[PDB]
Design a protein around this nucleic acid. Structure first.
Lengths: 328, 389, 146, 329, 323
DNA sequence: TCAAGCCTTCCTTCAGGTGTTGCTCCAGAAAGGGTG
DNA sequence: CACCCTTTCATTATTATTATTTTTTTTTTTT
């Protein structure tokens, strides 16, 4: 079954990309050598196929959140909001390797390849949390297919499909936000501001001569330490953008869909970014469609009461021995 | 009241027009000169005209962007039009007064757009309170429809893509059903596509008019019947009229502000009945929705020579200027302009074959952008790839 | 290839901050007072896989109706990743003539017929059947190069 | 904890943006080559998806103060008003690297790649100050989320929560303000004035000779002179802005410390242009997780947060900042 | 420290607006092309957010003296009036770069890309003068925040509301003032008036011949133009804030406010535009002005009096020196 | 009731920004040890 | 022997990076 979550990000979206990306102070991405450049960590973008323009397919950039970030965000909000209060109201104590299997997609319960009988495969895929992702040494296929957060954008019209043409963006969706770090010893005003420093004026002066000597030595080398004074750039996806999120479940139970629904009920407090200091990735949910039928309201989720009762009786009955038996 | 509250099955004939009909319905227009002639049979509406003068784009897609004297003048218009005595005032005048007050009350709310246009006869004061967004009303029709079949002659964009179509009528994606189209070979079989064209690009210039008109003279000399030459504007068709008048004489029909499509079509049947070979500088409704298949020979379409030549003088870009199409273009971009031009050109090319069995049909495209190396005319080539030699 | 062969990066790490708060709250029983990003449960791992947007054409002898019934459920191909890759826009099956079809472009056993062995086939260790990821079933095979 | 403070800037707001940006004399911004072009530092622009007209969600410019600047202002307000005043009230002192980690998160470049200890991460994230901003040579996640300061504006309806549709402005929010660097010695009106300048008249006339040589060099081309004519874009004053200060699973003392900062936000400048009084603000309200707890005197509500931060800062010491500050390598 | 000075301008205020504005004979500012339009610079303008319909907030223009204009004015009225007599009476003599840094805040437009040592920054932020304005080639941040002069208006009500409701005034505050430069050789019309000319009547007549040739890029003396002023008589306030002031610095600002009367708000000099009289000084909300001067606040005046004594130019020389 | 403005000015030189600014780390796991 | 610390070893080497260029029509048959 399918759940499509249409959200708008209250704050910008930043999911950092690999590679060495350089921007000038004006904005030119990846300059030829021989000119001053700048460190830049762009948001994650894939080259996707485009039937826009002509009937032939052209490769266009599309700035997304990766699906792994979506999967881990959904996982972590189910653990932080419903799973952990249930397991600490009972007194359950997880183990590393079972906590690592539940909270991450890792096999450190036993690094060995654990054999999995088909009956135990069935009894762990029907678990309200465990069967969604799986993981661990069993390496069994989880039931939850979490897609990338795709912005409603004309470069993604092949990914988005028909029906999103209304309320659709176009053009550039990335803004290169420039950030910086200043050496705060240079910000020190007088004796009242410096009295908390051990050494005070002497220590502040010593750091100023150390930074000065390091900077002049680096500039003389230009014609290996590093100071605090930084100024860098990062591309973010623009705030207020609308995004679709596809969550397709491969033969789910009622309790698993109820767990995903209670994740969507409480995911307003979650963030989706590499900008947690800057409150990046705050979003509100505008629509949640189950099997094509919208279910989201302003006061949380209204509908799917069978899923809510199923997940209530699922999270009530868990005693974390199933997590330990899932790990080893 | 006139239709059932729930339609179990709705079939729409010529569905491509239907959204425009909704765009026709949700515009409430205030006509000033019939009001001024009716009141003589107030000064606040004259001041509304004087403040209406100060505001080639005159306030397009602006609901309330500029209202310096627009809303007190509208309020004085409403109060001086609604408080006139109904007793003694004529039975046909109250229709004009009521449609003007309904249009003014549609204007007052601020939920609608405002547009200005002038009549083809003279520069009369025409004002419009229309709706550029139409998701609510048409969605209120689709929950009131159980199932629907939308049948048209230009319904689909490219192959099995009809995404913009369910964007115009705001069809829900869950209830949408996209069937493969029927494009038979006999629609493209008798038609002959000619390689020659007009080398000048269409730039609303007299030199293009002379070179294009020499190509129309060539086609009309090689015509064994009627010829329709299709334009998108009044200015270029008056240029072609001034370039072909003394050249062609009585063979030509022009369309203008004083020449409607129906009068021109009737003259086309008239001088095809007389045995002469007409040419028709047609625009507007001459693109979409005219029957150029003769009814004097129903049973034998092999002798149909009422329209032996279709010539498209220019690609119809920038034809749809409605509020909903402007808003939809502002979302989509250049692609919606290109696909709407493709649909208008497909309706333009559909005037040639209207029934199977016809023979010796000629199609001409004189736009030099088509035969150029530009990529934006790429769909326009693939539809011309359905014809050969 | 409709598109140039780009690359995807993915990373894996357990959130250390929630592990610390669960260690204090008693929900986590962790004797170690330090993680390790180079190995273990809190290992941060980075890995890069090729990404292709392509038309995928195969050749086979069989019943078209059963292949359509199987491929109707085929929402993903190449990776059943559960993370969003390989989503099928569509599929199409058509019958073609015998001499056009190169069935031989497949992992084959070394005792295959001389008309079935081609130049791009070479002798290697490969699976020819069933689970192609299962290295225990891998055999001495003659196979084509992608 | 999701604090929502609505501020009113009394003076203009100027968070400058990097880039080679130009303006003409009449105001053509980023004009084409071949015309008289002037230096311009635009304020911080955030492209936001907005509902312009009817539908048509498009990336329009709003003018913001970044979350780094607002977050640093919060960092400096609780530090210079609550943390180090109550921390020099007794003999607690920090090293200069501990000062650097308390003000900028880190004490050096090239931070170590080793992780931090679990009990260490846990006791720092429960600290009244350190948990809100966790830097250091081993990266630590800060409890404080500080969003960019957004004007209550019709370009930010997809940013802003409900209930703020009233008292809400629309249209352009910037103004170009022109500062001209005027050589001061041409304002010297007498030799009475020149007595304090060196050499009497000879050094002033030498600077005029110097100006004439630089002017002839620049004119025939068409160091550097002291004429500094320039313009900077600011956000206009009187605006109501929203500022969102989130806290994921907050301690009582940490929310009390942010509350005491908001109670001591008076006479602080927001972004930049310190010489021109830019950034003075009077906060109209604070929304503590949906509830309105601002009167014009101060907070005067939520006594649990003030008691928690009071017992936190009585027990405050520097040793937490040192064990935050030393590198493991 | 909050300083809220209350001035009423005695004269029209004109702070030139950069650009190229135009006006007709009437008050139509920036006419469409085709009509005979005259060049115009306006009063420097700042948009506020204000409520037009008492509930709806809109950007509305308000005419101001800018904050940097008043900052340079405060720099001029402490430097010439108390700093220069203290420098002269002690025989202290600045350098040319030191004087430039004392006024412009920078000896050279190029700054050295180095930071100063902290003992230097502490000494010059302890300065009664350099601590206020800062500057230098190494970019010292000052202790003085100078805001723009705001007329007490409907528009400034969301700027200022600390007891300024009753004496708030409503209505437009501008006025266009015209000025024509006539060639005065076209007005002498006499032989007594031409005897002062070297060359005399033939020289004057030759100038008339050049005017005849040029009247139909040598531009003559003819000019008709206009400038927009604020009206006189209305009452403004000024925000002067201090971040971490010494008592010396705030005493220096107070001494500026005591001798602020015979100084011009920077503007149109020849028309005597900047004249104003201080109606009050709110000192952290305390009104300490009188018709004689500043009553009360004697510790600030005492501190700057000790501060002025012992003032030396060695710090002004150290502050202006680059790397 | 007549008079119910004629002409001419339509801005001149300036005014060029300077410094810094280049990222950092890591994404190993088998080796011995030590402790319940 | 399950839970961790902390040691240890390894050989070559270079660096390129997709982004756009309308026309201005007057239809239709609602209240």
């Amino acid at each position: 079954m399918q759940i499509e979550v249409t959200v708008r990000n209250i704050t910008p979206i930043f999911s950092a990309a690999p590679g060495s990306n350089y921007i000038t102070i004006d904005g030119t991405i990846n300059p030829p050598p021989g000119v001053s450049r700048f460190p830049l960590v762009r948001t994650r973008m894939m080259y996707v196929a485009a039937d826009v323009g002509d009937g032939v397919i052209k490769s266009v950039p599309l700035q997304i959140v990766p699906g792994n970030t979506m999967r881990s965000l959904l996982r972590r909000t189910m653990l932080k909001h419903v799973i952990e209060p249930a397991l600490v109201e009972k007194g359950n104590k997880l183990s590393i390797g079972a906590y690592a299997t539940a909270y991450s997609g890792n096999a450190t319960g036993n690094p060995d390849g654990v054999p999995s009988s088909f009956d135990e495969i069935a009894t762990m895929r029907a678990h309200p949390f465990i069967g969604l992702f799986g993981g661990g040494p069993r390496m069994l296929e989880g039931r939850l297919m979490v897609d990338s957060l795709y912005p409603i954008h004309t470069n993604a019209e092949r990914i988005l499909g028909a029906g999103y043409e209304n309320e659709m963006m176009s053009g550039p969706i990335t803004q290169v936000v420039w950030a910086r770090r200043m050496d705060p010893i240079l910000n020190l005003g007088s004796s009242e501001d410096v009295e908390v420093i051990n050494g005070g004026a002497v220590a502040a002066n010593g750091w100023i001569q150390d930074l000065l000597a390091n900077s002049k030595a680096a500039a003389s080398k230009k014609k290996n330490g590093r100071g605090l004074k930084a100024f860098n750039a990062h591309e973010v996806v623009i705030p207020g953008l609308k995004w679709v999120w596809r969550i397709s479940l491969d033969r789910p139970t009622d309790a698993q869909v109820g767990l995903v629904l209670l994740a969507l009920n409480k995911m307003t407090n979650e963030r989706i970014a590499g900008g947690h200091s800057k409150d990046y990735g705050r979003f509100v949910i505008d629509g949640v469609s189950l099997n094509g039928e919208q279910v989201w309201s302003q006061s949380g989720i209204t509908g799917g009461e069978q899923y809510f009762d199923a997940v209530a009786e699922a999270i009530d009955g868990l005693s974390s021995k199933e997590f330990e038996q899932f790990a080893q | 009241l006139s239709l059932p509250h729930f339609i179990d099955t709705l079939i729409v004939d010529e569905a491509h027009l239907l959204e425009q009909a909704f765009a026709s319905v949700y515009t409430h227009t205030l006509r000033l000169r019939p009001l001024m002639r009716t009141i003589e049979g107030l000064d606040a509406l004259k001041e509304l005209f004087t403040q209406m003068q100060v505001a080639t784009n005159t306030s397009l897609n602006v609901p309330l962007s500029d209202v310096p004297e627009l809303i007190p003048a509208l309020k004085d218009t409403v109060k001086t039009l609604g408080a006139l005595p109904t007793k003694g005032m004529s039975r046909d005048a109250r229709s004009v007064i009521r449609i003007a007050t309904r249009a003014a009350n549609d204007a007052l709310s601020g939920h609608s757009r405002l547009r200005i246009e002038v009549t083809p006869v003279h520069s009369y004061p025409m004002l419009l309170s229309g709706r550029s967004n139409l998701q609510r009303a048409l969605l209120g029709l689709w929950n009131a429809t159980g199932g629907a079949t939308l049948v048209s002659a230009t319904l689909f964009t490219t192959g099995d893509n009809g995404s913009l179509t369910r964007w115009k009528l705001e069809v829900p994606t869950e209830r949408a059903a996209f069937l493969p189209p029927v494009h038979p070979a006999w629609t493209t079989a008798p038609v002959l596509l000619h390689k020659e064209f007009c080398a000048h690009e269409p730039d609303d210039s007299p030199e293009w008019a002379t070179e294009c008109a020499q190509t129309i003279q060539g086609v009309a000399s090689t015509a064994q019947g009627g010829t329709l030459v299709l334009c998108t504007s009044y200015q270029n068709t008056e240029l072609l009229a001034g370039r072909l008048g003394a050249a062609l004489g009585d063979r030509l029909i022009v369309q203008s502000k004083t020449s409607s499509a129906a009068t021109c079509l009737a003259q086309f049947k008239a001088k095809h009945k007389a045995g002469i070979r007409p040419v028709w500088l047609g625009l507007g409704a001459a693109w979409t929705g005219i029957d150029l298949s003769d009814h004097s020979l129903p049973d034998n379409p092999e002798l149909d020579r009422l329209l032996s030549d279709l010539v498209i003088t220019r690609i119809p870009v920038g034809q749809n200027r409605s509020l909903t199409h402007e808003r939809r273009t502002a979302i989509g971009g250049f692609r919606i302009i290109s696909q709407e031009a493709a649909w208008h050109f497909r309706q333009g090319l559909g005037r040639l074959v209207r029934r199977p069995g016809v023979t010796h049909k000629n199609l001409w495209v004189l736009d030099a952008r088509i035969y150029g190396g530009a990529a934006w005319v790429a769909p326009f080539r693939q539809i011309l790839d359905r014809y050969k030699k | 290839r409709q598109l140039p062969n780009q690359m995807w990066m993915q990373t894996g790490r357990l959130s250390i901050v929630e592990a610390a708060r669960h260690r204090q709250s008693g929900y986590l029983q962790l004797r170690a007072g330090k993680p390790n990003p180079a190995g273990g449960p809190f290992k941060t791992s980075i890995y890069h896989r090729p990404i292709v947007q392509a038309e995928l054409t195969a050749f086979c002898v069989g019943d078209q109706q059963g292949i359509e019934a199987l491929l109707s459920e085929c929402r993903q191909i190449g990776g059943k990743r559960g993370v969003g890759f390989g989503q099928v826009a569509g599929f199409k099956v058509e019958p073609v003539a015998e001499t056009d079809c190169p069935w031989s472009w497949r992992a084959l056993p070394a005792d295959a017929d001389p008309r079935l062995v081609t130049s791009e086939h070479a002798r290697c260790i490969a699976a020819i059947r069933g689970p192609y990821w299962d290295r225990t079933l891998h055999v001495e095979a003659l196979a084509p190069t992608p």
